[PDB]
Amino acid sequence: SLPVIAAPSMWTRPQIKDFKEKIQQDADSVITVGRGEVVTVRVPTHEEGSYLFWEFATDNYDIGFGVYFEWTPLLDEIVPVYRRDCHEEVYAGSHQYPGRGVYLLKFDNSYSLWRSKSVYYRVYYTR
Amino acid sequence: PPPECINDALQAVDSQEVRDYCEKKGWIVNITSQVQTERNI
C-alpha cells in the first residue's frame, strides 16, 4: 500500500510580541511577502519518523499558510493553505516525517492586492 | 527521548523556555537559517 501520512498538529500561544522581538534578532527569519506574492520556505531533507516544528507570526494582518511535503516531483498536502490570524497570536504546529524529503511552508499573500505582509518564522526538527 | 513525546509536550506547555530546554539537551535543532526561499507571483 501507499504510505499512510500522519495528521498534522496545530496550536497557538498568546505571546506574539515576545516571539517577534526574539525572532527579530536573526534578520533572515523575517521576510516581507509582497502584494499577490507566494513565498515558499523549503526545509532541508531529514530522516523518516522525525518531526518538523514550525512557528510563525505577522505584524498587522493575516496571511495564507499551508504545508506540503516533497518526496526525494511528488507533493503531498499536509496542511491545506488557508488564512490565519497570526497577527493576533503566534501560530505553531508539527508533522511527523513520512519519509525522506523537503517540507514546503507556504506563506500565501496572493489574495492581497494592496497589502504586503511581514512574516516572522522559525523551524526545528527532532534528531 | 521519543519524538512523539517531544511533540505531545510542545502542544500543552509551549514556551521559549521549553524549546530552549529541548535544544540544549540536543533533542531539537534550529534549522531556520538553512532553508531555501522561492518567491512566485
Author numbering:
A (entry chain A): 365 to 436, 474 to 528
B (entry chain B): 16 to 56
The authors write:
However, in enterovirus-infected cells, the ACBD3 GOLD domain interacts preferentially with viral non-structural 3A proteins, which causes re-localization of ACBD3 to the sites of virus replication. In this study, we present a structural, biochemical, and biological characterization of the complexes composed of human ACBD3 and the 3A proteins of four representative enteroviruses.
This approach led to a successful crystallization of the GOLD: 3A/PV1 complex with an L24A point mutation within the PV1 3A protein. The overall structures of all solved GOLD: 3A complexes are highly similar to each other. This suggests that neither the L24A mutation in the GOLD: 3A/PV1 complex nor the fusion-protein strategy used for the GOLD: 3A/EVA71 complex affected the overall fold of the complexes. For instance, the poliovirus 3A strand β23A/PV1 binds in the antiparallel orientation to the strand V402ACBD3-P408ACBD3 of ACBD3, while the aichivirus 3A strand β13A/AiV1 binds at the same position to the same strand of ACBD3, but in the parallel orientation. Superposition of the crystal structures of the enterovirus and kobuvirus 3A: GOLD complexes reveals that the enterovirus and kobuvirus 3A proteins bind to the same regions of the ACBD3 GOLD domain, nevertheless, the polypeptide chains of the enterovirus and kobuvirus 3A proteins have opposite polarities.
